[PDB]
Amino acid sequence: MRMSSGNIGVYKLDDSRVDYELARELYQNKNANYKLGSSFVRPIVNSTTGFMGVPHFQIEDEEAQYILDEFVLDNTSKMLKTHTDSLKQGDCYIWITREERENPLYPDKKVRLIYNFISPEEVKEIILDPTTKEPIAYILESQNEWTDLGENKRKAKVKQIITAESRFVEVEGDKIEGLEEGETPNVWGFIPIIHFKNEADETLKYGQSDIEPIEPLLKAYHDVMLHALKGSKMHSTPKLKLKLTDVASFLAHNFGVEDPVKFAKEGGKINLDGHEILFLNKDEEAEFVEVKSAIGDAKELLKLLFYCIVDVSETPEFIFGVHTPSALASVKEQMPIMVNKIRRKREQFTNSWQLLARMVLIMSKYSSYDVTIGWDEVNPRDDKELAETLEKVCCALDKALEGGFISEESTVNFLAQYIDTMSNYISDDPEREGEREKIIKTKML
Amino acid sequence: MRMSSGNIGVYKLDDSRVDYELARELYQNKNANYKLGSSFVRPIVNSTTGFMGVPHFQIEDEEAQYILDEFVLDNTSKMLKTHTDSLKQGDCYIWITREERENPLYPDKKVRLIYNFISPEEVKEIILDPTTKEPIAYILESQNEWTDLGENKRKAKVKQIITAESRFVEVEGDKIEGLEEGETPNVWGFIPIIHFKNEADETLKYGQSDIEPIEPLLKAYHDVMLHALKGSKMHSTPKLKLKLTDVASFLAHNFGVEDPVKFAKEGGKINLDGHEILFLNKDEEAEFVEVKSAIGDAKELLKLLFYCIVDVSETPEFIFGVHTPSALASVKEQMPIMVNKIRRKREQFTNSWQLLARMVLIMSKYSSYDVTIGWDEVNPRDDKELAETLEKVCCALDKALEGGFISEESTVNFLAQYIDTMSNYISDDPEREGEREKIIKTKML
Amino acid sequence: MRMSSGNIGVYKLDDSRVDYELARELYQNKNANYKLGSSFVRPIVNSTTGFMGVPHFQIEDEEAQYILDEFVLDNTSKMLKTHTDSLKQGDCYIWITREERENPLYPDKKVRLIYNFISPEEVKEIILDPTTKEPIAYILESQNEWTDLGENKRKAKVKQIITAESRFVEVEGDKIEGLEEGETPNVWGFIPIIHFKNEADETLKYGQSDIEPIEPLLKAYHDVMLHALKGSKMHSTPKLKLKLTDVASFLAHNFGVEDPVKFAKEGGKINLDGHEILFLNKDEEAEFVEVKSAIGDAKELLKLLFYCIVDVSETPEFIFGVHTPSALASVKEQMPIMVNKIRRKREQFTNSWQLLARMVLIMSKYSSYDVTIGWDEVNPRDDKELAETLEKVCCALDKALEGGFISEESTVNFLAQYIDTMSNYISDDPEREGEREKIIKTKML
């Protein structure tokens, strides 16, 4: 809708948050006000996060590439879980910490970088530079209830400030052995936390969940389904109606109910086997009071709400093929829509992955720190087709000999692409198999 | 749903558990409150477990690879059962123990590593390091009722603390020969227990079952089915209605029921053959009191609940194609959805398998310990197609001769992939056939 | 459902059993309370058993391989029967015994190993080591009623205690000709009994049948079908209704029933031919009292219960193609689901088969005892396709000559696989044809 040039309020950044507990309950189908309606949350979020896969850190420096190779080999699962958490809860925070912890379970790796998650409820507040809107302090706070290895219950409320200059931690309650209260300087001059933000908007300080667009539709679906279920429970089973000359004597004789008022008060149930035969007087009548449909048009409304949910989430129909069996027959025909959705979705996180890879490289001399992110194939290419186009390129070259060296450049680049695309396995996240094969090849030769 | 920046409680870790008894009863279809509804639990969990297969331990060191080869050859079945238990009960605990005991059933194996399951109810409490959340003690407790090899019944309530420094065990009852009470030092400086955690969440101490998202839907499905069955039992069979001048005389003459009150009180049943003929005087009337539908709209509600269950579990429709025969015609078309789901599910456990392999290597010098996890083919590739693309690669090479030395690297890597993918059998979990073929080839040559 | 960290009872091993008599009656369709419903037990169990086939014992030691070859040649039928018994009854026990008894029917075999079945009801109790939960004594007991070769009936209650050190047997009643009472030491220091356990669970001492998940659904199906049959018998045939001026006079004149009360009491039947014609007064009326449907919605309920049974058992729909004719058109499209089910199921028994083969080798020096279990093809590969990929591999090699010496290692392994896969016949369980072809080839040359 339009408005005049004037008559508009002053811009202000919105610092509202996603209510992460409700988002997790909806995802896990736990919230009693959405139980029948929140069935759609899991397929949407999980299909979106599974098809988008995990990033592929590409950097021209070989040492930086080795560092990122080791990092992805250690943390591909957590990298996928980051996408899942960002899509579900709106915000996900990743804390990179370097530990020199010696323990006999890790004799190979003396020093490690840990891919720690900060739960979005731990982040009490984010202090932003007003100009650049980049963080200058993270306020983390949590309640730690833990039993000691003896018999003592322990409780400790720990809060901490993480800033570029230093990090400060203070705790009230039982002492934590692994924490040192007070300020401690930051080994690097940047905050080691990466803020992954789903559906990042310039006007919002925090991200938005994929559940938020569908949440009113989920509530409406739950309401319609619950009303339908209650109505069917009340009215689907027909009610036998007996118009009798004397009700009380009929009850006393047939069912032994000498006191029908007391019987109704105590919740007594008349027992029936289903094979009864009715003997009645001339005047007495028996009929079934029955509904044509206890649900009526609720099914159409649920269908319309399902259509609205599918529209909002932009999920391809094969993800919900049980509702629409047509989609199940042409999934490869549906794949362009999924590819478009994943193309749009991957750009939200790729800058955060650039930041994460840059921080990992800095935390461990290199000639470059900018990292380009590849991704898993949403619509995988057959190896046979790739080899076919390779053969076509090769036979097309070695002819029209005035081409020059660009033929060599094109074919060597194509082989570089081909090896990477062939080695990466379709049904496995990340390129860990590529690194494994390369390392085994280098060692065994 | 949105909320203000403030007005949020302090973060606290959730230590709730999955109620493993109910999960097993629902899986086995035993719980009386879910019998008609819990039919869906088995296909979901078992399809997800069968299609995700078992891990393939890959490590560059040949001795470590041999150790892991022997381990998988021994314990592939238990590795699959680990996935089944994690998906069903939410939590599964694997205890690795080294046994030097000699018995004549195993003369080949002087020393063995045992893949022991700790039932999730045995784990009374897990003591976590508050900072890293690394487990520092496991509180195992169980009630051991066992018959003696003689005639005596025996009973003992065994509890034990498993810690990195040592393990402490105490018993309350009939003393057990195989257990030594008191502290005994731990040969390795880590707790040799792997906590497999289905649907691991940062905010939860324990895992989540795949039954939890569908559980309210299973309960609703059971309620609808049971109400439908009871209504059909009571009302599906039409009730013959006789409007008579004198009911008691009719009963006394036709059926010999000269005391209808006593007859109804004692539960007497009038006997009919089905070929009756009704002779009535002019005033009397006979009619069937009949329902148009004793079930009404319960079938539509069950269809909707089935759709919701399929959505929540994200099961591909061909798993439940008896409901929807359309899916059964295009299973290969629907396989990519299963591939996506199995990718996402496999990423949950792979870190635990890396930990397990690392512990196994440590519990039995090696230049590397970072094991990498391969997996079974969700949608297998045909061997002929792999050979065709290999032929295409081979013919593409040896032409455009400025490609360089990387052609040999690419082709030898493809051969290494090809032999591995061919030797592994589709219809058999794990790569045990690969190891056995390699060993037989090495011995017989 | 969720629960608190506390508020849970102590873990205890469940020693309940499967009620094997009821399981066999359900399989054989004998139990009176399941006759109409237990039709589904046979196709489920028998399809699962037939498709899973029998193990293939593979060991690199040629002498051990020969021993296992002879064993499977003798006992493949009993190996399949073991799977059938385990799936049906939950438990199945195999007792390996070595017999030196000479008889003229076996002049070729001085010494034999017998594959005996212990019926699961014979096993009165299993004494388990409390720590390892391995058996240390089997309590077998049975009532032996047998006729003497003369005219005498004989009865004897024989119980025995099979332990690792010795087996003790004591018998009441008539003297058994072939049994010696009292203790006798074991020639080997292990109990030669293999406990095959279908759906083995860590919390259950004994196995559990595939009938247990479906049993309540079978009962519900039987109840619905029986109620439908009784209702149809009572009410399907319409009841002719005559509204007469004088009923008794009509009966006496037409059907000669001078005493209708005595006629009804004695169960007399009025005889009709079907071609009657009714002559009536003005006031008299005749009408058919008829039901619109004596079954009502029981057909929908039986369909829903059939769907639930198919879901629980996870059987592919082509096993029940008579219900769903769609499945009959695309069995080869359905076969991946069967392959998945059999993949999951085979892991339950493969460890037991490894134990059995280990015992057989020990009960008859060898350099290895670990046996790898192959299996029949659930979805067989065409020989022509295998040969096609063979020639593709062969032509792919011998080119790009820098591949090295691993080409021979790959192709010899491929030929070893090809010979085994070709010789094994699809429509015959086990590899007995393979062993016999090998033996005939070696003998005739």
Author numbering:
A (entry chain C), B (entry chain D), C (entry chain E): 19 to 382, 389 to 469
Text lifted from the article:
At the base of the capsid sits a unique opening, centered on what would be a fivefold symmetry axis in a complete icosahedron; it is made up of 12 copies of portal protein gp45, forming an opening through which DNA is ejected from the capsid. Thus, there is a 5–12-fold symmetry mismatch between the capsid and the portal.
